[PDB]
Write a protein that binds this ligand. Structure first.
Ligand code: CDL
Ligand code: FMN
Ligand code: SF4
Lengths: 429, 56
């Protein structure tokens, strides 16, 4: 294929995205969840890991690592420690809200995914870390887990397969950084949400100092379907190395901001117009898009005209797919203020552990604040570019990268707006 | 600068020079002892970017 989009509803995985059907066990089973789960568990981890590899599934938490190879780090003989699957339901990236819909409307996909994914990893239990603000969502997930226990689908002798598996839910307490995979582990252990250095990698030393895999909610919740319908089925959607379906969030200045499932590699223009009702004020009223959540660099309208929504297409546009959260800004937006407010967000979420982000992000924030008013000189723009490059690649975790990239996108595509603002301040003073 | 004309002629003739044009005593030609404040320039390393110390 060379064209993507127009995903058929028979090919949509999250068939209860909008919560118009019973989310509890009876509704989930009637839609195809928990079907032949024993047979999947009896095929063994190597077969399960084989399907995931053949599917071309990539991490849906924002980094997009190939899932089959990542999960295979856990397929090693036991050294005596317990093994765990940690499901990352922190869902903290601004613009992102797809994992919220799975947890409250398709919780039994996530629970079954935890079992199927945990079997492939050899885990004994799954810890689902869910942000503390998602209290009602966490309560729904907990009711679904109880249903799954009472039906024998999880627990001792799960699905009758002879495999023991537990599913714990542990709530967060308000921290974007706790979505980072090793900060999440540190939080489950009762410490501050400060990321770990690597190595060790979690597959060797993770939660409680044990073999551990952290997987995104969307990543785990699709694993049972990939196994039932085949990795070949999943790989048949999207471009090569960009396989599958994807949950998109379209927010900002669109007519009908929404969450939808669509084929990977759909054009950004097609996605905004078909599902979100188009850009407020028309397509020509578009100024810029943030394609993959606040951490990804913005792209201007000229780039949005033809860009495809997948990992490799957006990297060539000098940004990334990220969580696939699309924040649209129309021509009435103060683009400098919009990005400045994202830098303020990163200033509030920095764990403060490491120097470049503890000091640098707060420094970038003060500079962006003056750029909004124009109270600066054009020489400071290149100074700000160099500052962001001293943070990127020098910090412990990717939050420092996630703060530098939005600034670089703004300077990359909107330098004349920044300079014009400085020129205006110079006259009025 | 206050020598009489006769004395100026006498010392010019005795020296064979026009001494009045190049008096060794200073008068009003020197600069004022109060000056406006300077504003000194800064050197080439006073830059906000493209200025890493390991390059200089
Ligand atoms: C030789 C003797 C010459 C007597 C003439 C004295 C005289 O008038 O000279 C001053 C007068 C001014 O000279 P200047 O260098 O241009 O002075 C700079 C200012 O213009 C000067 O302007 P100023 O604003 O400075 O004037 C203020 C000044 C006022 O200046 C004066 O009034 C000078 C007064 C000097 C009068 C002396 C008369 C000579 C008396 C003879 C006694 C001594 C010899 C024995 O006020 C004073 O300071 C006066 C204080 C008192 C000074 C003490 C003098 C007493 C001498 C006598 C001793 C007695 C005890 O001389 C002339 O105008 C030129 C003609 C004078 C004759 C010159 C002949 C030169 C010698 C020939 C060459 C041979 C070399 C070998
Ligand atoms: C600051 C920060 C916040 C993150 N938040 C989340 C998150 O909320 N959910 C998520 O799945 N991954 C998040 N990640 C990415 C995780 O570190 C990790 O890549 C992901 O959980 C891996 O699972 P996956 O391969 O299935 O995507 C975050 C990373 C950073 C640096
Ligand atoms: S980059 Fe920021 S959030 Fe990440 S460890 Fe360093 S200080 Fe903490």
């Amino acid at each position: 294929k060379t064209s993507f989009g127009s995903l058929k509803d028979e090919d949509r995985i999250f068939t209860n995205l909008y919560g118009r059907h019973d989310w509890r066990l009876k509704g989930a089973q009637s839609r195809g969840d928990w079907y032949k789960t024993k047979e999947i568990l009896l095929k063994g981890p190597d077969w399960i890991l084989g399907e995931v590899k053949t599917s071309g599934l990539r991490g849906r938490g924002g980094a997009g690592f190939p899932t089959g190879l990542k999960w295979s780090f856990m397929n090693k003989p036991s050294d005596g420690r317990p093994k765990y699957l940690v499901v990352n339901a922190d869902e903290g990236e601004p613009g992102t809200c797809k994992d919220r819909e799975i947890i409250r409307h398709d919780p039994h996909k996530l629970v079954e995914g935890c079992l199927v994914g945990g079997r492939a990893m050899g885990a004994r239990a799954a810890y689902i870390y869910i942000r503390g603000e998602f209290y009602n969502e966490a309560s729904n997930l907990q009711v679904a887990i109880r249903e799954a226990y009472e039906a024998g689908l999880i627990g001792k002798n799960a699905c009758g397969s002879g495999y023991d598996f537990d599913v714990f839910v542990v709530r967060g307490a308000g921290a974007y950084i706790c979505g980072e995979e090793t900060a999440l582990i540190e939080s489950i252990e009762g410490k501050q949400g400060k990321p770990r250095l690597k190595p060790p990698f979690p597959a060797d030393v993770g939660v409680f100092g044990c073999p551990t895999t952290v997987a995104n909610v969307e990543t785990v919740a699709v694993s049972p379907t990939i196994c039932r319908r085949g990795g070949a089925w999943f790989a048949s959607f999207g471009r090569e190395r960009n396989s599958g379906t994807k949950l998109f969030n379209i927010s900002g200045h669109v007519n009908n901001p929404c969450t939808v499932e669509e084929e990977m590699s759909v054009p950004l223009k097609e996605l905004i117009e078909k599902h979100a009702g188009g850009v407020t004020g028309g397509w020509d009223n578009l100024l810029a898009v943030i394609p993959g959540g606040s951490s990804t660099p913005l792209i201007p309208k000229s780039v949005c005209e033809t860009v495809l929504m997948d990992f490799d297409a957006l990297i060539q546009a000098q940004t990334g797919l990220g969580t696939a959260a699309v924040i649209v800004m129309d021509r009435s937006t103060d683009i400098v203020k919009a990005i400045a407010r994202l830098i303020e967000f990163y200033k509030h979420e920095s764990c403060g552990q490491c120097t470049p982000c503890r000091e640098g992000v707060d420094w970038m924030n003060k500079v962006m604040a003056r750029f909004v008013r124009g109270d600066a000189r054009p020489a400071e723009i290149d100074s700000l570019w160099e500052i962001s490059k001293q943070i990127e690649g020098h910090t412990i975790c990717a939050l420092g990268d996630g703060a530098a990239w939005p600034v670089q996108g703004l300077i990359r595509h909107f330098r004349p707006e920044l300079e014009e603002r400085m020129q205006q301040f110079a006259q009025q003073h | 600068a206050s020598a009489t004309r006769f004395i100026q002629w006498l010392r010019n003739w005795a020296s064979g020079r026009d001494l009045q044009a190049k008096l060794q005593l200073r008068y009003q030609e020197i600069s004022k002892r109060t000056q406006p404040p300077p504003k000194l320039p800064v050197g080439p390393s006073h830059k906000l970017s493209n200025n890493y110390y390991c390059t200089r």
